[PDB]
Design a protein around this ligand. Structure first.
Ligand SMILES: Nc1nc2c(ncn2[C@@H]2O[C@H](COP(=O)(O)OP(=O)(O)OP(=O)(O)O)[C@@H](O)[C@H]2O)c(=O)[nH]1
Ligand SMILES: Nc1nc2c(ncn2[C@@H]2O[C@H](COP(=O)(O)OP(=O)(O)OP(=O)(O)O)[C@@H](O)[C@H]2O)c(=O)[nH]1
Lengths: 376, 375
C-alpha cells in the first residue's frame, strides 16, 4: 500500500524483461519512446527512478546526457540498460552519474537489489521537495526577464548551502539577493548577518573572527552569532590580508574564538563584490585560495541598464512606498516623468533610484510628479 | 588493479563498517581535517568517498563546499550518519551522494551498495590502469594543475557528449579541444576549429547552412565535420539567430547542403573566455542551448596559477622557434628564468610564445638575458 514511480525510456516496447519484475512488485513504471517526449514527462513526474535504454539501440549520447542533467538533476536518479557493450566510449558515458547498469540476461531476484538501494533516496527527495516556489515574494526588487532568470536561479542555488559569490554593479541588490537565497536555503529560520567590510579598519575586522576585549565584555564575534545561518561579506576584496587569512582559516576548521573559550560554529559564507576581481587577483592583492573557496557558485545581479522595463515598476513601487509612509501627497508619475525615468542611465542603479525618489517625494508638493520635479 | 575509496572523519571510532570493508580487502583511506581532504581529493581524481557527518564534527558549509568544490564528476559521493540525523539537512543529498549509511551495519547490503559503486569506479579503472603517468605530452606543458587537466580530459574525453571549454585568453582551449578529440572515438575523424569572433552573422549563416546569394557549391562546416568534431571558439560571440541554429542542429542533428538537407553526426565543443553568468542573466546566450553544451566542463588554468610551467614552456618555444628561423639562441640565462616567471601573463601561453618568438627573431646571442626579453 506504499510505493513510488520509476519510468524508463526505450524505442522497443518489446523490451519488457525488467518491467514486470518491477510491475508485479509494485512500481509505477511509465515508458517513453521519443527524445522530445521524455523531457516533458520528467518535468511532471518529479522525483522518480529513470532508466535509459542505451542498449545497442538508439538516442544521441549528447541528447541523453542533456536529458540526464537538463533540469532533472537529482529528481531523476540515473539508471541505464545495455546489450553488453563493455568496450568503447559508451562505458565512459557512465561518468554521467548513471549509478548502475543492466546486463543482457534477466536476473529476476538480483535486479531488485540494485534498484532498491535508490528507494531511500527517492523517498527523501519526495520529503525535501515541498520547498517548491512561492512567487519569490515579488522577487524582492522587481520582476521582468533578466530578473526572472535571476529569480529562477536564486531558487536553485539557495538550498545547496555552498558558498556563493554575489557580484554586480554597485547598489544593485546583491545584499537583498543574499537574504533571498538565505531564506530559500534549508537554514532559513536561522540568523542572517550582513557585514560591511569596506568601513572597518584591520583592527575592527580582527574583532570579527575572535572579537576583542580581554574579558567577556558582551562582545562575541560576528561568526558566533551567525551560527546555523548565513553571514554576508559585502565588498569582500576590501579585506586586509590578515583577515582574508582568518576567513580562509575559519572556512577550514569551522571555528571562531570567543572570550568564553574557542568555540566552533556553522556559517554559510556569502561574498559580495563590485570591483575588478581579476585585476585584484593577478596583481596578487587578493588570496586566490580564498577566492576559490568562495566562488563555488556565482550569481550576477543585473544593473538597471539591463532591466530597463523594470525601472517604471520600481519607481512606481518606491513612490507608493515613500508617499504612503511620509504622509506625502504624490500618487503617480506624469507620462512625462515615466518616459524620462527610463532615459536616465542610473549608475547607482536601484539605490540611486530609491534615494532620488525619496528626495522627490519629500520635496514635491503635487499629486502627480512631473519630469521637472525629478532630476533637477 | 586497485580499489581506491577514501572517507573523511576525525573520529576514526566510526570503525563498525570499516573492517567490514577492510577485511574483505578494500583500500579505505581516512582524513581528519577538512583542509587535508580538499588537497587529497583534487589530486586523487576518480574514487569513492564516504562522508561521516553523523551528529559529529564538520561544517555543512565546509562539507557542501568540498563535495562540490570541483569534485563534480571525479568523485562518486557517499555519506555516513547516526540513525537519528535527517530532517534538518537532508538537502545535502541534493549533491547526488548516491546513498547513505544507517547506524546499524547491513553487512551484505553494505558491500552491495558500495561494491556496485566500486564496480562503477572499476569501469573508469578499466581505461585507467595507466594511472596518472603524467600524460600524453599534455600537448603544451606539464606541472600539477595540468596533470589534473589531463586527469579530467582522460575521463571526460571519450564520452561522445559535448564539453564546454572555459579558460582565460590564450590558455590552450583549442589545443585542449584537439586533445579531447584525440581521446574520443572519432579522433581519426575530422577536427574543425572555428573562429566565431572574426565572422559576421552572415558568414555564420552560410554554415548551418543558411542562405547567402546562392547559387552555390558550398559545404558547411557541419557538413565537413561529419563523423568528426566541430569546435566553436568564443561561443558567446554568436548572435542569437546563430545560437538558435546551433541549438536547432543540436536537437535535429541535421545540416543543409546545396543538393538538399542531409543529417550528420558531429560532437560539438565550445570555447569561452568571457563571464558566462553575466551573459546568461542579460539574455545574450540562449539558456536551453547553454545546457546542451555545458553538459560537461573543462577548465584550463592561466599561467598566473601554474607559474612553474612558465620556465618549462618558455624553454620549449625557444627550442622550436630558434630551430625554425636559423636563429642563434639556445637557452635562457638564470637571470631570464627568474624574471620570465615574475610576469603576470594576461595572454598566458599564447602571449608567451609571441614574446619569445619576437626575441628569437631579434637577439643575436646564444644565451638570452633578462634584458633581451621584455624590452
Ligand atoms: N534586514 C537587514 N537589512 C540590512 C542589513 N544591513 C544593511 N541592510 C539594508 O539593506 C539595504 C540595502 O538595500 P538596497 O537599497 O536595495 O541597496 P542594494 O542594491 O541592495 O545594495 P548592494 O547589495 O550593495 O547592491 C540598506 O538600506 C541597508 O540599510 C541587515 O543586516 N539586515
Ligand atoms: N603545436 C601545435 N600548435 C597548433 C596546431 N594547430 C594550431 N596550433 C596553434 O596552437 C594554438 C593553440 O594553443 P594556444 O597558443 O594556447 O592558443 P589557445 O589558448 O588555444 O587560444 P584560445 O583558445 O583563444 O585561448 C592555436 O591558436 C593555434 O594557433 C598544431 O597542430 N600543433
Amino acid at each position: 500500500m506504499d510505493s513510488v514511480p520509476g519510468s524508463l525510456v526505450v524505442v522497443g516496447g518489446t523490451y519488457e524483461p525488467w518491467l514486470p519484475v518491477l510491475e508485479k512488485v509494485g512500481w509505477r513504471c511509465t515508458q517513453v519512446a521519443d527524445l522530445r517526449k521524455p523531457d516533458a514527462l520528467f518535468v511532471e513526474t518529479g522525483p522518480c527512478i529513470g532508466i535509459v535504454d542505451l542498449s545497442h539501440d538508439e538516442f544521441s549520447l549528447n541528447g541523453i546526457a542533456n536529458l540526464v542533467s537538463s533540469h532533472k538533476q537529482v529528481r531523476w536518479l540515473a539508471f541505464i540498460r545495455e546489450a553488453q557493450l563493455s568496450s568503447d566510449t559508451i562505458c565512459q558515458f557512465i561518468v554521467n552519474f548513471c549509478i548502475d547498469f543492466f546486463t543482457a540476461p534477466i536476473p529476476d531476484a538480483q535486479l531488485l537489489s540494485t534498484i532498491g538501494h535508490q528507494l531511500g533516496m527517492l523517498k527523501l527527495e519526495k520529503k525535501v521537495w515541498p520547498h517548491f516556489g512561492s512567487a519569490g515574494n515579488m522577487g524582492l526588487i522587481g520582476e521582468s526577464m533578466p530578473m526572472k532568470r535571476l529569480r529562477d536561479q536564486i531558487k536553485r542555488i539557495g538550498p545547496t548551502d555552498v558558498s556563493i559569490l554575489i557580484y554586480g554593479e554597485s547598489g544593485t541588490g546583491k545584499e537583498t539577493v543574499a537574504k533571498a537565497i538565505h531564506k530559500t536555503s534549508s537554514r532559513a529560520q536561522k540568523p542572517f548577518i550582513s557585514v560591511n567590510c569596506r568601513a572597518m579598519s584591520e583592527k575592527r575586522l580582527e574583532s570579527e573572527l575572535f572579537g576583542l576585549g580581554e574579558t567577556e565584555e558582551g562582545q562575541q564575534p560576528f561568526l558566533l552569532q551567525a551560527d546555523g545561518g548565513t553571514l554576508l561579506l559585502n565588498d569582500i576584496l576590501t579585506l586586509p590580508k590578515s583577515q582574508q587569512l582568518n576567513l580562509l582559516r575559519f572556512l577550514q576548521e569551522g571555528t571562531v574564538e570567543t572570550r568564553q573559550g574557542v568555540r566552533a560554529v556553522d556559517v554559510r559564507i556569502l561574498a559580495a563584490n563590485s570591483s575588478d576581481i581579476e585585476k585584484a587577483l593577478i596583481d596578487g592583492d587578493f588570496n586566490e585560495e580564498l577566492y576559490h573557496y568562495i566562488n563555488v557558485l556565482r550569481i550576477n545581479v543585473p544593473s538597471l541598464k539591463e532591466r530597463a522595463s523594470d525601472i517604471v515598476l520600481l519607481a512606481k513601487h518606491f513612490l507608493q512606498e515613500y508617499s504612503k509612509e511620509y504622509n506625502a501627497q504624490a500618487r503617480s508619475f506624469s507620462d512625462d516623468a515615466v518616459r524620462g525615468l527610463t532615459r536616465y542611465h542610473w549608475p547607482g542603479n536601484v539605490r540611486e533610484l530609491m534615494n532620488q525618489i525619496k528626495r522627490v517625494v519629500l520635496m514635491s508638493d503635487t499629486v502627480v510628479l512631473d519630469e521637472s520635479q525629478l532630476d533637477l
